Structure formats: C-alpha cells, structure tokens
Design an enzyme around this catalytic site. Structure first.
Site, PDB file in Angstrom:
ATOM      1  N   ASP A 251      -6.056 -43.270   3.911  1.00 49.09           N
ATOM      2  CA  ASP A 251      -6.146 -41.815   4.090  1.00 49.09           C
ATOM      3  C   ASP A 251      -5.031 -41.347   5.025  1.00 49.09           C
ATOM      4  O   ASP A 251      -4.674 -42.054   5.975  1.00 49.09           O
ATOM      5  CB  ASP A 251      -7.547 -41.432   4.617  1.00 49.09           C
ATOM      6  CG  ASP A 251      -7.906 -39.968   4.382  1.00 49.09           C
ATOM      7  OD1 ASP A 251      -7.064 -39.171   3.923  1.00 49.09           O
ATOM      8  OD2 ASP A 251      -9.074 -39.602   4.665  1.00 49.09           O
TER       9      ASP A 251
ATOM     10  N   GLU B   9     -14.064 -35.234  -1.013  1.00 45.97           N
ATOM     11  CA  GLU B   9     -14.062 -35.695   0.372  1.00 45.97           C
ATOM     12  C   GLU B   9     -14.070 -34.506   1.330  1.00 45.97           C
ATOM     13  O   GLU B   9     -14.780 -34.527   2.345  1.00 45.97           O
ATOM     14  CB  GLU B   9     -12.851 -36.600   0.625  1.00 45.97           C
ATOM     15  CG  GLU B   9     -12.810 -37.273   1.998  1.00 45.97           C
ATOM     16  CD  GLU B   9     -12.208 -36.430   3.103  1.00 45.97           C
ATOM     17  OE1 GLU B   9     -11.511 -35.434   2.822  1.00 45.97           O
ATOM     18  OE2 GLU B   9     -12.423 -36.793   4.278  1.00 45.97           O
TER      19      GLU B   9
HETATM   20  C1  LIG Z   1      -6.240 -33.801  14.025  1.00 48.70           C
HETATM   21  O1  LIG Z   1      -6.733 -35.068  14.472  1.00 48.70           O
HETATM   22  C2  LIG Z   1      -8.060 -35.302  14.262  1.00 48.70           C
HETATM   23  C3  LIG Z   1      -8.950 -34.369  13.717  1.00 48.70           C
HETATM   24  C4  LIG Z   1     -10.291 -34.722  13.551  1.00 48.70           C
HETATM   25  C5  LIG Z   1     -10.739 -35.999  13.914  1.00 48.70           C
HETATM   26  N1  LIG Z   1     -12.025 -36.359  13.781  1.00 48.70           N
HETATM   27  C6  LIG Z   1     -12.618 -36.494  12.572  1.00 48.70           C
HETATM   28  S1  LIG Z   1     -14.306 -36.971  12.494  1.00 48.70           S
HETATM   29  N2  LIG Z   1     -11.903 -36.236  11.459  1.00 48.70           N
HETATM   30  C7  LIG Z   1     -12.438 -36.340  10.085  1.00 48.70           C
HETATM   31  C8  LIG Z   1     -11.269 -36.286   9.100  1.00 48.70           C
HETATM   32  C9  LIG Z   1     -11.767 -36.226   7.651  1.00 48.70           C
HETATM   33  N3  LIG Z   1     -10.622 -36.040   6.761  1.00 48.70           N
HETATM   34  C10 LIG Z   1      -9.852 -36.995   6.234  1.00 48.70           C
HETATM   35  C11 LIG Z   1      -8.913 -36.398   5.497  1.00 48.70           C
HETATM   36  N4  LIG Z   1      -9.095 -35.075   5.581  1.00 48.70           N
HETATM   37  C12 LIG Z   1     -10.161 -34.860   6.361  1.00 48.70           C
HETATM   38  C13 LIG Z   1      -9.846 -36.921  14.468  1.00 48.70           C
HETATM   39  C14 LIG Z   1      -8.504 -36.571  14.633  1.00 48.70           C
HETATM   40  O2  LIG Z   1      -7.552 -37.406  15.158  1.00 48.70           O
HETATM   41  C15 LIG Z   1      -7.957 -38.769  15.336  1.00 48.70           C
HETATM   42 ZN   LIG Z   2      -8.023 -33.589   4.717  1.00 45.21          ZN
END
Ligand SMILES: COc1ccc(NC(=S)NCCCn2ccnc2)cc1OC
Ligand SMILES: [Zn+2]
EC number: 2.3.2.5
Length: 324
Positions: free
Chosen positions: A209, A154
């Site tokens: 997740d 992932e």
């Molecule tokens: C820190 O807060 C955020 C940071 C990024 C995003 N936007 C996206 S598109 N994130 C994809 C996460 C994919 N992923 C799942 C697990 N490890 C990685 C949103 C956030 O708060 C809503």
């Molecule tokens: Zn992550």
C-alpha cells in the site's frame, strides 16, 4: 516459534536474475491502465476490475470475484474483490494483496497513483514477469501456491471509521472464515497444519500500500512475521551488494526495509485477516508519502527508480519464498 516453512536463501544466480530489469516498458504499460480515477460505482472502476481479471485469466490463473452490495454513508454501493490463484488445489497460499479502488476526493479528481495504482501494477507485473517460473512451480505438487487479492472498497466514503472503510477486506475475511474445509480435501498441506476454513490456507498475507514515492521507510509491524520480514531486509541488502539498485549517486545504498520494528498502528485491508490469525507483512511506508490523499498523488509524483528497486525486491522475494 519457527516459521512453518523452512525459508531457503536465494542462490546468488537467482538473486542476480531477479534483480535484472523492456521490463520497465512492460511494467509502465501495465501501470498506465491503473492511472485513472476508479471510484466505487464508476465505469472506470469496472474497466480496471475487468483488466485485472482478463490479465490474470490470460496467464491461466484461476480468477474469482467476490461481489456484493454494501451500505455506506453514500447509500448502497457495489463492491467486487478480485482473487487470482495460481494453483487453487494447493493447500497453502503466499498471498500478495493491495486495493484497487480510489478515494472519492471532494476537492477534485484523485488518481491515487501510490494509493494503490502502483501496487496493483506491481502485482500484475509479478504474475507476468514470473509466469514461466510460476507455471513450472505449480507442477511440483508441493502444497504451496501464489494468490493475488485486489481488494475493493478499502477507502472511506466520508470520515474513516470501522463501519466506513475496508468494505471488501471485511467481506472477504468473513466469507473465507465461514467457508469450512480440511486438509484431506486439499493438496499437500504441511504436517503440522490446522485447517478448518479457507482463511487458514492464507500462509502469510503481504499487503502492499502507498508505494511509488521516493525513499519509503518500512518497518516490521508484526512480530509473528519477523522471519518473513527479515527476508525482505536480506534481499534488499544483497541487491545493493550486487550493485542492482538504482541510486542518484554511486556508493549509495537503499535502506527501505529498516532492520527494526516500529510501534505504529495503521488500519488497512489486513485488519480483518489479522483478527482471524492470518500472519501479516504490511509493506506500507511510515511516514506516508507527502502526497497522501491529496490531488498531487498522481503519475508525475511517482519515483521510477524507487519503483524499479521495489520490483526487484518483490521478484526476488517471491522467487525465494516459492523457490522459483
Ligand atoms: C498521513 O500519515 C498517516 C495518516 C493516517 C495514519 N493512520 C492510519 S490508521 N491510517 C489508515 C490509512 C488507510 N489507508 C491506506 C490507504 N489509504 C488509506 C497514519 C499515518 O502515517 C503513519
Ligand atoms: Zn488512501
């Protein structure tokens, strides 16, 4: 449009039974196996994969591995998705999913306790704790089953991009879309079903997740699955009514599943499936845990009462959906 399956409310007796938590002990023993760094390409990643497979084979599930090599910004890497299916022949699957790889963090050893060691343990815990009822449900010939998918790869190896992320989920979605099938080959498909390939058999994918931190806030991310999401809201409310949630003080209630939708876009393992019309319920908090992608995403920053509460909601949800 109505949900294709009539969603029959859990009887009070079953709500109370599913909301009871030795249960803590079994879950914590399971979780211990995941609280290790498990980067793609590592021995510990292999050991985690094997532990998932053995755990589910021991419960008499059909377990398959979707293994492949993929190009990454760090060169060729091996990936293996793990797919466990309670009754392979059942036309439709309630799919629960998470990712089992951990982020390769440049600052040091990263446990990814919420991301997603806890979700991994929760899927195994559901299979174990509900085993008797699941094996009974499998005998009904009703065309519905449970499927657990533990996605590999992932995480991005460098900066998150369409090409550097979701290696396992992109691979599996393509594989299943290209694998042709039809209702006549499968057991008890719903009357109105359009089945042309394996992806059509995923009735809904519930993707867990970033779970395990205190007071997560969930919202409905997809109108298509509002009827399913609303069952989570309802189950949580009823567990609180029954006094089965662990709270820091008397007369508090959990409010994890907000009775609202949010306009927020989160990229995750559901994306390749969403693009192929798989209904998605994305059980990911917004905001993300404070520890997200930091070296503090570790065992001690987990909140055990929250995990127990989520386990109750999830057990009750699976019981309701499958009529266990
Ligand atoms: C820190 O807060 C955020 C940071 C990024 C995003 N936007 C996206 S598109 N994130 C994809 C996460 C994919 N992923 C799942 C697990 N490890 C990685 C949103 C956030 O708060 C809503
Ligand atoms: Zn992550």
């Amino acid at each position: 449009l109505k949900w294709p399956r009539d969603l029959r409310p859990l009887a009070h007796h079953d709500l109370l039974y599913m909301g009871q938590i030795e249960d803590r002990g079994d879950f914590n023993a399971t979780l211990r196996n995941f609280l290790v760094p498990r980067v793609v390409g590592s021995q510990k990643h292999r050991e985690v994969r094997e532990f998932i497979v053995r755990s589910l084979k021991d419960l008499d599930w059909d377990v398959e591995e979707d293994c492949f090599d993929g190009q990454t910004p760090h060169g060729i890497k091996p990936f293996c998705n793990v797919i466990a299916t309670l009754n392979p022949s059942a036309c439709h699957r309630l799919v629960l999913a998470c990712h089992y790889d951990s982020l390769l963090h440049k600052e040091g050893t990263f446990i990814g306790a919420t991301d997603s060691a806890v979700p991994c343990a929760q899927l195994l815990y559901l299979a174990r704790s509900l085993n008797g009822k699941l094996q009974n449900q499998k005998t009904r010939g009703d065309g519905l089953t449970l499927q657990l998918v533990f996605f590999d790869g992932e995480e991005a190896f460098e900066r998150w991009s369409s090409h550097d992320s979701l290696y396992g989920s992109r691979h599996l979605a393509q594989k299943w879309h290209e694998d042709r099938t039809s209702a006549e080959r499968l057991e008890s498909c719903l009357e109105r079903s359009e089945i042309a390939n394996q992806i059509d058999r995923m009735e809904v994918m519930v993707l867990l997740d970033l779970l395990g931190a205190e007071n997560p806030r969930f919202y409905s991310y997809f109108g298509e699955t509002q009827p399913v999401y609303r069952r989570l809201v309802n189950i949580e409310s009823r567990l609180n009514d029954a006094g089965l949630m662990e709270l820091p003080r008397r007369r508090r209630r959990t409010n994890y599943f907000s009775n609202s939708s949010t306009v927020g876009f989160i990229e995750d393992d559901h994306i390749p499936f969403l693009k192929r019309s798989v209904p998605i319920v994305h059980i990911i908090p917004s905001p993300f845990p404070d520890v997200w992608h930091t070296l503090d995403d570790n065992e001690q920053n987990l909140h055990h009462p929250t995990i127990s509460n989520l386990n109750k909601i999830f057990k009750a949800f699976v019981s309701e959906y499958l009529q266990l």
